[PDB]
Amino acid sequence: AAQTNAPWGLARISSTSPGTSTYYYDESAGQGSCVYVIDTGIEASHPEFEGRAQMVKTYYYSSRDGNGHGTHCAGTVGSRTYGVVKKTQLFGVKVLDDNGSGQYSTIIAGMDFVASDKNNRNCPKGVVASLSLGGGYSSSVNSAAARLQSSGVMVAVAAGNNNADARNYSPASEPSVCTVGASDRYDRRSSFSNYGSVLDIFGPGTSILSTWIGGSTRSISGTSMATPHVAGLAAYLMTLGKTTAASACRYIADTANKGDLSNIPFGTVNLLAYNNYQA
């Protein structure tokens, strides 16, 4: 299948060069897989989700996304127009408040929740979790991420947006999960993207168009935005039967576009997520 005039990030992940505009993908489109989006919530009624999204847990007074961030990131995972895996099922877990902030204790709870909840869902092709969030280093937050991964969920996390070594950030610095940096249209590392040896892979993160709250759309930048491109790609590859939850991050790095990115500091991987599609 081909989506013509797609968002640049979608085109980039199905191409071996920058500057294309068509997103090529297998029609299976991640059907039978599930992606938990752990964020500010999801506006599940947005038409772009086609009834494939639902809120399963909140840690605040409401389950509604009053922020937009979570809705945007879900959209990059699996909205019709803006999504990598256009037929995946999306589950929203609200660990962040409507200002975009949350305590580590509640972020940890949300992770432990997903590890258990996936046991009562029908997700034949596997289960992914997308965490476009993070803060300063915390061994407890790293440990919760590691548990979620070991439970059999493909965990993809943001590297952080400080233009710094991601070793000092939590979400990011846990080696066992998939830590994602951000790149821009021209194949440069995004100016804000964290880097370092703990990064596994880069995805598109600058000027990413997707769904927003109030049934709208919006372009936003941040290494947060790259995360869902890799989460969606994992779900897509898992439904194809190419890889499993446990080995997805490695499989993605193995099959990545290698050496394309500029402004990568020595000691950081130069690998850009790539679907390897062939008609």
11 binds, among Hg ion, Ca ion, none (CB under 5 to 8 A by kind): none
Q: Is 185 exposed, middle or buried (0-12, 13-18, 19+ CB in 10 A)?
A: middle
104: exposed, middle or buried (C-beta count within 10 Å: 0-12, 13-18, 19+)? middle
Give yes or no: 187 in active site: no
How many chain residues are in contact with Ca ion, going by CB under 5 A?
2
Contact 206, 275 (CB under 8 A): no
Q: What share of the chain is helix, strand, coil (3-state, %, to 5)?
A: 25, 25, 50
String of contacts with Hg ion for each residue 58-97, x by CB under 5 A: -----------x--xx------------------------
Residues 175-204 that bind Hg ion (CB under 5 A): none
| Residue whose CB is less far from Hg ion, 177 or 243 | 177
Say whether 69 is catalytic.
Answer: yes
Nearer to Hg ion, 13 or 243 (CB): 13
Using CB under 5 A as the binding rule, whether residue 48 contacts Ca ion is answered as: no
Q: Does 98 bind Ca ion (CB under 5 A)?
A: no
Under the criterion CB under 5 A, does residue 159 sit at the interface with Ca ion?
no
- Residue 260 labeled ligand binder: yes
Element of type H or E holding 234? helix 223-240
Residue 6 tokens read as 């797609």
Catalogue the active-site residues.
Answer: 39, 69, 224
